Structures are given as C-alpha cells and as structure tokens.
C-alpha cells in the first residue's frame, strides 16, 4: 500500500552462555591488538612530522604513506603559541582548482575561530593569520585518495601553495595517502613539480600486512583463547591460507570475520560443546551417550581394539552393554591438552629472536605442523638446521578430537561467506526442482514462470529476436492445461469473459511472457540494446 513511498519508518540456553564467556574474552584480545597498530601508526607519523630542520627552509615537507588504506586518521601535537590544524580533501571534493581551494580555506577557518574565542575564503587569510588570530600557522593536508584525482588539478594546486612561501609565519606539510604504486605517481605529475617535491621526502610504509607482524600475532592470540578446548583441522586452515591470500589490503579484519563465524558454527550445532568444562559432567544423558557413538575416531579405535585384542569380551562389555564404563571410556580421553598449541608457541618466539626471522606465516606453520611438514617448513631459511631436532614434533594421531574441532567438512562457510554468486543463481534457474516441492496439479505438469524460458534462453543466440523467442516460448506451453486453468474459477466474472474468448491462449502467453522478460531487466540478465527500437536484445549472462 505504502511501499511506493520511500523509507517510511514504523514502530511495531545452557549452551549459548558458555559461548558468551568465550567470545568477548577473545574480542578483548582483538581490539587491544587493534589499538596497538593504531598507536603505532599515530606514533611514527608524529615524530617524523617534526624535528626535520632542513637548511633551505623554503620547502614544504612531504610524506608518502605507501600501501595505506585511505582511512588512516592522524592526531596532532598541541604545540602552544601556534595553532596546528588538519585539512582533509576527498576526491569527491576535488572538482577543480577553484573549489579545492575554497572549501579547504573554509574548513580551517571554522577550525580557527573555535580555538580563537566577513572574511574572504582564499589566501588572503594566510598572510594575515598572524594578525587575524595572533599565533602562527602550521597546517597539514590529509589527501585521502590521491590517485583518483586528475593530477593536473593537483599539479596546479601545489603551485598555488608555492606562492605562500614568502610570509615566513606559516608552515606547510603534505600527507599523501596513496593506495599503492609510487612509481605511478611520479609518472602523472609535471616534472617541474616533482623537483619541487623532492626536497625532503619520506617514504614511510604503512601497511596492515607488513611482514605479518600482526597477522601472525592475531592468529596466535586466537590459539590461546581456544587452548585445549578444541582443535583446528587441516582442511579448515588451508581455507584460511587460500582465501586470506586473496585479500591483500586487510587480512586482519578478515581473519576476525572468518574465525568468529567459524566459532559461531561450533556452538550452534555441536552437543558436546558443554563438556569443554569438566564441571558439566552431570548434564550427561543417554541421548548424549547415543550421539557419541558415531564419531569416526571412536569407531576406528574399536576396529583398532578388535585387531589388537582378538579377545573382544572386554571390548563388547565396554560397548553399550555398559553405560557407566562406556562414558568412563570417553572421559579417559577428555582432558587432552594437545600440545601442538604449546609446541607452536614454543617455536614461534624462537625463530622470532633466536634466528631472528620475520618473513614467516604462523598459520601454515600451524598447518605444516598438522601434517608433519615442519621439517620442510624451516628449510626456506636454512637457519633451523642446528635446531630442527629440538624444534621437532611429530603430529600424533590424537583420539576423540573430532568432537572438539573446526573444519569446513560441510562446505558451510565456503558457501555462506564466499558464495558462488552467479553459479548459484544459474543453478537455481535450470533445475528449480530442489528449491520448490486445485491449481498445484498444473504445477506438476508446468514449470514456474521465470525458469521455463531459461532453458531456451540458454539455447538462443548471442543477440536474439524478441518475437521468435516468444514463438519458441509458445511451443513449451500446451494448450489444454491453460483453458483448464483459465476456466478453473467460476467465482470471478471479469476473468471469465476472457476465459471464453477463443484467442485467450495466445493472449495469455504474451501477458505471461511480458511479466517474465519484464522481470529479467532488474536482474541485468538481458539488456535492451538501442532503446525505442527494442526488436533485438543482448544476453550477457553465460554459464561461466
């Protein structure tokens, strides 16, 4: 009723608590690491912004922050008897030379009155700032996304700032937050201005992924938060190797996402999650005792039991013939610490400072541990050759770990996080039987509306004719069902006069065809080439 008006508002667990004591505790380790790099980035700009006393003293100091994410915020020193202001210029606010000047002079001016306790918004204020506001000026220019701007505007901008170098009560500082590709930037500008730039340049790198000093760190703080109460399987962690390698800019926010979603999967379906604290042994039930039986390492050890002990009268008794000894057989292996966690923490600090190696990934270090490829892991520096015997660990085939583990053995978080998008749509439209289970008898003898043309839509050419496609569409519809369908309702009258018309079938097809190809434009599957002609269209969607 109201849906054509836009944005109308209206004003209409024993398991989960053990998640709640684990989740936030992990997240205290997350954000405390997040402010560490936040304090790191804010520090290394601040000292380098100051103490650089050049001899010519007629040049601005420039700073190239390579690899930076265009969101790096900056704080400034107080530095009394001089105001220090920050101006940010987003490529959305870069239309010309003119408004790049005019908005920027406006942005400092309100920042100037707020600290001060009619004028014109150009460089007139810059010289009279000594008289307009008393203390001197040191402005800084947070160019947020520098490679999207037309550089001749930027090149003409910096020559305008070059004229301000003759007043001696103002200091200029430029911050170039590039995304990447410093060699691209010295190509675009005028070479007369690069020689203006090259007085005191500083190529400080700011990257979230820099030698994995935080990537290996945040996975390490993940491991102790789940220490001894779970495991991480091999097929799980290689997914974390492969998919996180596909995102260069921000691994660290992504590793929080795919790990915490993985932990959300475990608490939501696994019944033995309650038993990670041994105080919860009183919650034991036969239904819990029944579902413990189908563990693969459980039944395999029983196959190991019979072949080792060909007397099986003991093994048959400890089966479901007893239940007290049966769970006592389980809680024998309950407290398995699995020191692969601790052995990782043993070797992680070692090569960090004993051999002092930094170009390493702790996750595949954990993964090569899971197969036994730690020997073929340390080889890539040939520096643990004196230490491959003391850092050695053979991964033991541990038992009952399949109840406390995380793995994408179901393809869940492969699907729900990285969905094969146009694959799952195209699979939905060719098949349609595994999505959908008086008038439903028609449905068992006639396809749904969107999908029935789709099989011929595959079987059509690159650019297709509209009418012959409908002519082919009329072939798929048999005649007797529609007149059985159009005459199904005796209650309505306005439909029934159309129902008795002898050309109703050929009219109801073009009505139904012009509801489906009407609905293949908002999906972008078919594009109407050369509007007001629309005799032929173009299909972009291919199967792959």
């Amino acid at each position: 009723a109201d849906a054509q008006r836009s944005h109308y508002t209206v004003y209409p667990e024993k398991r989960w608590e053990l998640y709640h004591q684990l989740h936030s505790h992990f997240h205290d380790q997350v954000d405390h690491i997040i402010d560490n790099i936040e304090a790191d980035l804010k520090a290394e700009i601040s000292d380098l912004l100051y103490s650089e006393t050049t001899q010519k003293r007629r040049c601005f100091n420039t700073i190239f922050l390579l690899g930076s994410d265009s969101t790096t915020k900056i704080e400034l020193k107080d530095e009394s008897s001089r105001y220090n202001v920050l101006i940010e210029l987003t490529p959305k606010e870069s239309p010309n030379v003119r408004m790049m000047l005019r908005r920027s002079m406006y942005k400092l001016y309100s920042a100037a009155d707020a600290e001060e306790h009619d004028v014109s918004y150009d460089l007139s204020l810059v010289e009279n700032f000594k008289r307009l506001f008393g203390k001197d000026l040191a402005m800084v220019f947070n160019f947020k996304d520098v490679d999207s701007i037309n550089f001749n505007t930027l090149d003409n901008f910096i020559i305008l700032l070059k004229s301000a170098f003759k007043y001696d009560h103002v200091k200029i500082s430029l911050i170039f937050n590039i995304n990447t590709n410093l060699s691209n930037i010295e190509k675009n500008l005028r070479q007369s201005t690069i020689r203006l730039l090259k007085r005191n340049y500083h190529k400080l790198d700011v990257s979230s992924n820099k030698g994995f000093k935080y990537g290996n760190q945040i996975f390490q703080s993940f491991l102790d938060t789940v220490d001894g109460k779970l495991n991480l399987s091999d097929r799980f962690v290689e997914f974390i190797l492969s998919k996180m390698a596909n995102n260069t800019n921000h691994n660290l926010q992504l590793l929080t996402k795919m790990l915490d979603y993985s932990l959300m999967s475990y608490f939501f379906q696994n019944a033995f999650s309650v038993f990670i604290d041994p105080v919860n042994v009183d919650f034991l039930n036969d239904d819990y005792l029944k579902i413990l039986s189908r563990c693969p390492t459980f039944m395999f050890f029983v196959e190991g039991l019979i072949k080792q002990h060909a007397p099986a009268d003991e093994i048959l008794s400890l089966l479901t013939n007893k239940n007290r000894g049966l769970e006592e057989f389980f809680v024998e292996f309950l407290v398995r610490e699995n020191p692969i966690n601790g052995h990782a923490k043993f070797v992680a600090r070692f090569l960090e400072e004993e051999l002092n190696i930094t170009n390493f990934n702790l996750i595949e270090l954990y993964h090569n541990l899971l197969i036994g490829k730690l020997d073929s892991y340390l080889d890539r520096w040939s520096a643990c050759k004196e230490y491959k015997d003391r850092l050695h660990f053979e991964p033991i085939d541990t038992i009952f770990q399949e109840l406390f583990t995380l793995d994408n053995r179901s393809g869940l978080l492969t699907q729900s996080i990285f969905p094969s998008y146009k694959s799952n749509i195209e699979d939905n439209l060719l098949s349609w039987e595994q999505v959908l289970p008086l008038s439903g008898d028609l449905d068992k003898i006639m396809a749904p509306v969107l999908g029935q043309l789709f099989k011929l839509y595959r079987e059509a050419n690159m650019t297709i004719n509209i009418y012959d496609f409908y002519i082919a569409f009329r072939e798929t519809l048999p005649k007797e069902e529609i007149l059985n369908f159009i005459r199904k309702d005796p209650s309505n009258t306005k439909l029934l006069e159309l129902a008795e018309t002898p050309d109703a079938f050929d009219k109801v097809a073009l009505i139904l065809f012009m509801q489906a190809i009407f609905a293949f434009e908002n999906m972008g599957l078919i594009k109407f080439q050369s509007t007001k002609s629309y005799d032929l269209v173009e299909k972009c969607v291919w199967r792959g």
Partner: protein, 325 residues
Amino acid sequence: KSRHTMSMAPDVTREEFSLVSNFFNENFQKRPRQKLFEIQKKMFPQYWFELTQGFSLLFYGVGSKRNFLEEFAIDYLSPKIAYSQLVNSIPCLILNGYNPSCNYRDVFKEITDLLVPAELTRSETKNHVILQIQKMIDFYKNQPLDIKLILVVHNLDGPSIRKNTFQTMLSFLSVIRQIAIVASTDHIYAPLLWDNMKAQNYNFVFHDISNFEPSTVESTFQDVMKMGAEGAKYVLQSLTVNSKKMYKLLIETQMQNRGTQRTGVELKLFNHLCAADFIASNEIALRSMLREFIEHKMANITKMEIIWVPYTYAELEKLLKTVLN
C-alpha cells in the same frame, strides 16, 4: 531481413493485462510457495543469533524478496530482540531502493533523528555528512553494546542506492555495533559494488532465498512498450466528429497501398479528396486540424508531398474497425 516484431503481436489493453497477471501471481504455484516459506522459517533463530555480532546480513537469490524481508524484519525479529534485552519495540527504518527518489541527505537526516540527538549535532551541520557520521562513530565505540535500530534496504542495486556516494555512506554505518543491517539485492553483478575497503566496513554474510516471486511493487516503476499506436488510441476518442471522418479518409488511401512512407498521399490531392466529401474548405482549414494530428504525433510527413501514418499495416485496420467505426 524478414523479422517477426513485437508490433506484429496480438496486443492486450490495460485492464486485461493486469487482472490476469494478478490471477497467476496469486494462484499459479501457491501451495509450494508457502511450503518453501515454512521450510526457511526454521532459519529465523539462526539469523537472530548471528545478528547480535553486528553482521551486515545480505540476502541474494532469484525472485523478489520484498515480502520475505518485511515478514522477517517486522513481525519476527524486532519484538524478539526487545524481549531478549529485558516499552516500544525496536524502530524499523526500511529503505525502498526500487524507489528512485532516495537521496543521501534526506535519509541521513532521518537517521540522526532516529539515532540519539544527545549533543548539538546541528552545530556540526554546516558536505559534512561523512564529517557528522565520523563524530557519531567514535562516540559509539565506547557505548554499551545493544541494538537500538534495525534498518532494511530493499533492492540494494536500485537506481539511486547503487550511486557511489550513497554506497560509501552506508559503509560507515555498518561498522557501528548498535545497528543491524539487513538488506537484499537482486542484480547478477551486485558484488561488483564492493571492494575490500567497503566489505571491511561491511563484513557481509550471504544467504539464498529463492521463492520466484512476481515482484508486484517492483514492476510498477519499470516500463516496456506496454506502458504512439496506443498513445493516440485515446485522443481520437475525444475530439470533433469531423476529425474522425478526415482521419477515416486519411487512413483508407494510406492503407490502400507495415505502414511505411510509400503508402502515403500527396497534400494537394488529399486537400481535393477532403474537398470532395465537403469536408476541407481549403489548405489552412485542412492543415490547422491536421496540426492537431501533428501535435500529438499521430501522423508523419516525408518527401510528391507524402503524409503517412507511422503505425503498422495491422494497426491501421485495427484503428479502422474499432475506433473509427
């Protein structure tokens, strides 16, 4: 190039189309549709639990999802979360993305009024939109974690929401923990909209919903040649009675010979022909009530001085036997 064309189709009027369309979309596959709707109903507690983690939930899939979102947001979730925190329930702010009249200023002016005006944020109102939301974000980093608002964005690839200065605006909203972002798109190229910068702010997760809905509301703004041969079909129903006759004499000899240029007639003889039936006095009295057929683009002229009707061969005899007769 003998091509079958949409002009050579048995056409259907306005009331005839929409009624039989309404018959199918409410009686075609009704039983399996709610049979799907009961199957996916068990996923509703799973969405409630993940949404406490501030996850921007995104729904893809074939078919319209508009009915499904409004059941899931309004009736199910929004009172369930208010009961589980402990009074009016959680305010729902939908965004109709299929409505092209959505701007960035107006919806955010609703947002800061939907959110708390604890300070004089009109002082920072001076493009300050990214500026005003940045002062909203850092304050919200140190607040007690509870959802106070859930917003819905239908058809996120819509004609106004897919604009790039609006997209980045929603990106900064999603990093805040106090608001849950449940949106749906329909495009096949929807993940072209986001880079690793925005999805870092978004942390999207995905779920399939395919009910093969007809998109009743979402078909309204869209148009094809159903929505001129049909345009001048109504003007002739309200004119003078002489214009019917002088168009009848027009349409005869213009269909005496598709309706193209070559079947047309010269201006001089047509003046004499409409002088023959005591209709046209002269050229001016002919042309003035022929400019009315020109002003509503009901006839064409190219060069004999050929005036020809731009409608098809099939259309003019339909115009003959129905409205002229």
